[model samples]
Target chain A: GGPSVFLFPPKPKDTLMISRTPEVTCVVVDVSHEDPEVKFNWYVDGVEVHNAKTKPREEQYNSTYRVVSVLTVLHQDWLNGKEYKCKVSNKALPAPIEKTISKAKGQPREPQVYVYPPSRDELTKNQVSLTCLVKGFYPSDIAVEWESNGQPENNYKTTPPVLDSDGSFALVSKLTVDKSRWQQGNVFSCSVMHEALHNHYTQKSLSLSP
Target chain B: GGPSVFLFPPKPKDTLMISRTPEVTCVVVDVSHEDPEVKFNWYVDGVEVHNAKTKPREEQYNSTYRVVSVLTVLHQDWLNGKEYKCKVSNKALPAPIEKTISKAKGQPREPQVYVLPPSRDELTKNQVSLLCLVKGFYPSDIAVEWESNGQPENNYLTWPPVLDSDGSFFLYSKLTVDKSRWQQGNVFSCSVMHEALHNHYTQKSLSLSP
Candidate 1:
């Protein structure tokens, strides 16, 4: 008859797994214990946002998320380098469970690297471009790194990887070389970092002419 | 405990559902029954040919004939039509139920028909050739009949249709002009007959050219 508490956060092994991404617009939870029912809360940077919850008023599979739960499809751009958090609450339960999602970890996957050059062509400074493509990754927790002229740019100040399709990863890095600078031929390389895999993979670097 | 006597002659409903040609195959019964263990005896033209048993194995499913149990695959050549029967015996049941299958209601489907010009040229003798094409048909239960010169030969032969990448149905029938009997200028028509359709679908006829 009283609110029940589960030993604070319970044990680490007792955790429930919930996979999420920008594509994960809704989730369902069954709260059939108390009369007031239960409330679900979502957070971004410690602020509360309105998310749907289940009450006894709904029918079968009432706890399941619906299409209407989609407020807006979030892009990795707006939340890049920012953290996210989601918490669930109910009157019958003491404290809410908080999960801190790292911004870099919440970022979209790195787009697959694309292999260009129908045939080998000399890289001359007519603003020649080299692109790395990434696709088919989920949750966007991957980072794309490009090195040009032997110096790593502290920050990516150009076009960045973007979302492509459902349940997929896509990132494209375009490098525009100044032919005059490349007169003394240089190598351009691109690589991807995936948090899920905890590994960085690189494709064959393109070597252009001086 | 005893040598059970299961009836060889199956029920009419069972007999009606069988697609007989070449030989009869058995269709397994519902496996999710209270008593799953069962045995079956197969019949052809009302004669017992094999005895198969129901198995706990999930692989034995949707089999109309062969190895007697659902655990076995039933392969058949329907070109030769014959009625099939299946009798099931349960160890706990006092009597066995016999189900006969005949005339698998929709064996060969209504074939798509096409008419094309044969060779696309003029000839000196009675050069009458019409091409017929049928698609998506099994057992190729097709009869190509030829009618020409105020008489009927019904002797047009079929050519195997080209199997497309999509495994489309195709069969071609051509009626050649008989120079010895028919004149140079004669009219001929071709039609296909299938017992399932019970109708002759005619292809555009051609006239002999001189």
Candidate 2:
């Protein structure tokens, strides 16, 4: 009914990104029935920093005004575990919005692959199940695929990556094959591709009898 | 990692409290690792209003300081549908925060009572079910109870009030009774007490045969 102001990127529950060199950006957007009279401030390591620049943009839509302000910082100070934040103020707000940066930029690490042996039921039944566990990968972005007899196989399911306590990630991929074909001792493989291992893939292979 | 600021009674989604006379208040609390250097401003209906009052308080805990700012507005101009907002700023923030007040503070309306007829299945079952529907009430805070044969009944379920499109609310209360007692022509009643109704109650009564 009045005005709403938002600041981004929002602070994290824990620590933010820590890198060799980081570029931090924050934006404040306010939509108000009238001119919000918005203002901005930036802080680094709990100290006010005025060297950065602010960009102001405005638009009108449906009898309301939308104002956006951007703040950018490029520095190596964040590598020392320093804090960076953007605070937004407007006539429509009761308090300034505080948006802090998290240490998030990093390259992912190659995953380690583990192939669980087939179950006894899978060894004797009409279907064979093969499971591959990929662990200890960073950045969480990864691709997992199945291959049978050195060719890509499609009868598989890959789970979404799960975050680990160490800020790394793990995932599982399972493949189902006909028992008759599995009994032929054909090699089944699970391969993972990650940005950190752009030129190489982490792979694990297994046979059904085991 | 820098500072966190919060304001109470931020902004209303729709209408705020409306009264014959309104005394609106907003508070800002900021916890920062450094001195926040906070400032305050007030606006009424898109125009800056300097007549309101501001108060400041401070505290420190665990190497961080907590700043408290209070804004109070006492005026009759809000009755004309004027918007009131508090704007907050600090060096620890990149922008100021605006908190606005809604048009609240109005008395609720007395609810209408309706007694729905029982179903055929309820007539043949070992237990009897009765329902009372209360509609067209504001403020949402309401109390509904059951009465059987002129006595207060405890074995009943009252649902949370549901808001309608027009900012009013409706709800239902259900009472279950033994078939033998209900078939004996015992009267069942639903009683509602709301803030708007004050000491009075809206009630409806029905019999199983009815």
Candidate 3:
């Protein structure tokens, strides 16, 4: 006496070896009242494909669900650099459920950008060094720039991005400026450029005050 | 009925929390059934709590089921010791599934004790504090007592034991004694007792330098 839930992907894998000609299968799982009447619509790069089959529904549930809906396609479709989607719809689902599998990789992770205020040292009383720490970014390639009072500043050095234990990269860019400017309440900003960022970049700023 | 399934907590998460009170959570996921009659029972050291309604159940993709049963026990219970049992069952299940959480989990190891005297600030105070540092102990069950020349002193404070990320515990007990005790060079001792020591008493003694 519950609403049947619907969604995608089979756990214990594989449909690649069943046929003589290499075939690609997109599997989707949906559970409904024992006679759920679940529908599977497959699409290739936006066009619909009719080569889909809904397997035998498992029996324990009042919500009748299937071993899954598996859509098989030709090997050419798998290697042609496009995507396949399984849109599953049922009376129990408020909205149609869909899962897209393709030859493409997932999106890159964005970086967390932070700018530190000028650090003080005994020997460097006249000048202070501020830094921008960027971490947890993917694809490795990145660009960093600094600005003060909204105008670009070139008194900066950036380190080569270092790969973390995980696949992402981390790096730091430092700017050396006179303490007098920082003490006068000038704000410093650091901007980061990466392919994953929406505007192609992320920026952070810091002020001397608390 | 495809073997109505139920699974324990996933690969990660299950240690504990640093919340205001002692909270322990039990999660049962990856459950699928044609007619799942799911029930959750929580037992902490003893009888199952019948009125326990804190458990939350939700639906995942394709009829996979998930639920969490949380028990918020008093600090008193956690301070001393604790044991937990999470019992989950479904109508299709061959038998009930039970998970155990016990005080006997980690390695029971001895605590390294250190007796530290009042520093300059505390030294100048009318009432100075002597501290006992108990750290690097596993299974964190230990006691710290302050004795001055064999006399049990009052006016003491002990921070709740802290479990560091390194899997060891750190804690300190401070005993406030007047300058009179230090001026006279009274011998102070901090005694520690851990189960791993197995009948061996641990003590750290200190006195003011003449």
Candidate 4:
């Protein structure tokens, strides 16, 4: 059998916080000052970060030791939903303890939807672009689609989500429709899908006067 | 506080398949409805789907009746990663049963990542656009970002997740950087975030001289 071992908090700690700067700190327990220096490594989405911060192993009242390593990551990367990984290993540990976290730990917010009708300038064109703007959603995952007269519209262009001022995200899509159809009393719709809207209706429609 | 009641299979069934049509079926146990309209309503991404298909209650050998309701949804909508929901309500012994399913039910495949360096013709320009192509991932939600010399790079453009031929998803991102930097041995990377790659390293980097 292997020697005793444990990690700080004994389980994956909840470190999802408001600041974009994420720190993946690994604490090794049942360690000893005589054991040796504990190695620590941090990676942000596969690329190893060279400047990880660490602390010396300290003797505890139980005659054991404690070692801590902290890696401060770039805020924008955390905001972009990058994964931060931490690894701790030493001579005594039978196996290294590794932990990873992402922006998924943050709270989720449903997107606010908006469907804007084409301006007169855009209306005068042969094809008018129907705009769907989704705002302030968390976790940076959303599905945006365009529907024409209850039918799915295939030709639409959408941008990848953009981070909002807060920790949430937003995205925009454009679907170009023939001006005559919409002018002839046709309806165009934008359906924004999110887990939060699973059973709730979440689409905006727009029609221009003939 | 009432008589025992449960849905057949007791949980949501796995129905994701190659078939273009998606059916949200409900099976109720211990029903006594000779007049089994067995009312069922459905929602696709929160929009109520008015049409519901059902069958009359069939008497099981044990004298109990079984009811089945099939709500077929548009394949394109289903492929768009929409959520299909089924709500069952009647004078049952207890509360109604509701279930929701999405692309989440299908198996996940780690995304294929490729970092395309700037073409010689394009690299001759002062500003060069490095491209990252991601292919064949699923469940729709994904995050893509660019990194320069290990720091997060924000000035990049990524397209929305595009549906692939096999029902998986793909996307591409372009990052513009100074042509001189790469020639001077600077590195640029594309980091993609997916649930499948949390514990695994998932980044592709390109450098002309580094």
Top-lDDT structure, candidate number? 4
Stretches of candidate 2 off by over 4 Å are: A1-210, B1-27, B47-81, B103-111, B115-132, B136-169, B173-210
Off by over 4 Å in 1: A1-210, B1-83, B86-109, B116-128, B136-139, B149-151, B179-185, B195-204, B208-210
Error of 4 at A188 (Å): 0.7
Would you list the rank order by TM-score, best first?
3, 2, 4, 1
lDDT of 3 by residue, B1-210 (tens): 322323232111112222344456666666675644577787868777654444556787868666666666654354345666778787667787877664445766676665666644445657665666666687655666678766887766555566644477766666667889887989888877665554535777877877
Which model, 1 or 2, shows the larger lDDT?
2
Per-residue lDDT for A59 in model 1? 30
Q: Flag regions of model 3 displaced more than 4 Å.
A: A1-210, B1-102, B198-200
Score residue B5 of candidate 2 by CA lDDT: 49
Task: Give fnat (model 1).
Answer: 0.00
- Tell me the tens digit of each residue's lDDT in model 1 across B1-210: 322222232322222223421223344434433455656676666766644444443433543122234211122322234555566666555677666544333445555544433332212334334444454554344555567666776545554444322343345454545554445446666656554343324344555345
Residue-level lDDT of model 4, residues A127-161, one tens digit each, is 66566666667766556888876899966677778
Give the per-residue Cα lDDT of candidate 4 at A16: 26
Q: Give candidates' CA RMSD values in order.
A: 22.9, 22.2, 20.0, 22.0
Residue A94, candidate 1: Cα error in Å is 84
Output the lDDT of residue B59, model 3: 82
The TM-score measured for candidate 2 stands at: 0.29
> What level of docking quality does candidate 2 show?
incorrect
Q: Candidate 4: where is the Cα deviation over 4 Å?
A: A1-103, A198-201, B1-210
